């Protein structure tokens, strides 16, 4: 068994990928699994230990690149949209990706915002009129 | 001046009660929310 890791399972023909976190919803003795609106599998009872495990989708989202231009500088920053990226680079297999992407895909400067996470840009304590709108009240600039 | 001030204060006071006691006063925005939710729900339902 694996917890807090993205994995595709098979429970008596119930196929799907997700995270098998602990849950608290109470089932009924005759009920096998659970569903929510739009008919998507939500919770599945453990066949052996008789425990209910919630199922959540594996992480996914878009990628955006913040650049001040080409004539100004070649420095860019990467924003991963609506994903908690404080954990992505270690658990996943990044062997296929070249180290050229790895250098700019990690570092000591990782900023977690409400629109996702920002890699390659430092957080300052001074507020100015903003140039590039990131989202949720956060902007970026070349300083 | 005093009469006008009192009338304005009374109207401002009654505005809150008028807004809170009517269940359909703010229906111009819930309509938008419900329409967007219904559209998104219909799109996903087509996957089956």
């Amino acid at each position: 068994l694996v917890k807090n890791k993205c994995v595709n399972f098979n429970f008596n023909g119930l196929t799907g990928t997700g995270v098998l976190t602990e849950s608290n919803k109470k089932f009924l003795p005759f009920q096998q699994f659970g569903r929510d609106i739009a008919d998507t599998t939500d919770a599945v009872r453990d066949p052996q230990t008789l425990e209910i495990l919630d199922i959540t989708p594996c992480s996914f989202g878009g990628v955006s690149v913040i650049t001040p231009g080409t004539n100004t500088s070649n420095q860019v920053a990467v924003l991963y949209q609506d994903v908690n990226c404080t954990e992505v680079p270690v658990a996943i297999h990044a062997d296929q990706l070249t180290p050229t992407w790895r250098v700019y895909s990690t570092g000591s400067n990782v900023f977690q915002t409400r629109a996702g996470c920002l890699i390659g840009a430092e957080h300052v304590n001074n507020s100015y009129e903003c140039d590039i709108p990131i989202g949720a009240g956060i902007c970026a600039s070349y300083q | 001046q005093k009469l006008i001030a009192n009338q304005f204060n009374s109207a401002i006071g009654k505005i809150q009660d008028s807004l809170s006691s009517t269940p359909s006063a703010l229906g111009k925005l819930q309509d938008v929310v419900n329409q967007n939710a219904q559209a998104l729900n219909t799109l996903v339902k087509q996957l089956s």
Binding site: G61, G62, D82, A115, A136, G137 | -
Partner: peptide, 25 residues
């Protein structure tokens, strides 16, 4: 704000947060 009240994310459908948070408005 109390009178009007409003989630899921599946099948490659995402919702982007607004630029102006409600505090700014």
């Amino acid at each position: 704000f109390n009178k009007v009240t409003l989630a899921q994310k599946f099948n490659g459908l995402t919702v982007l947060p607004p630029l102006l948070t409600d505090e700014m408005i």
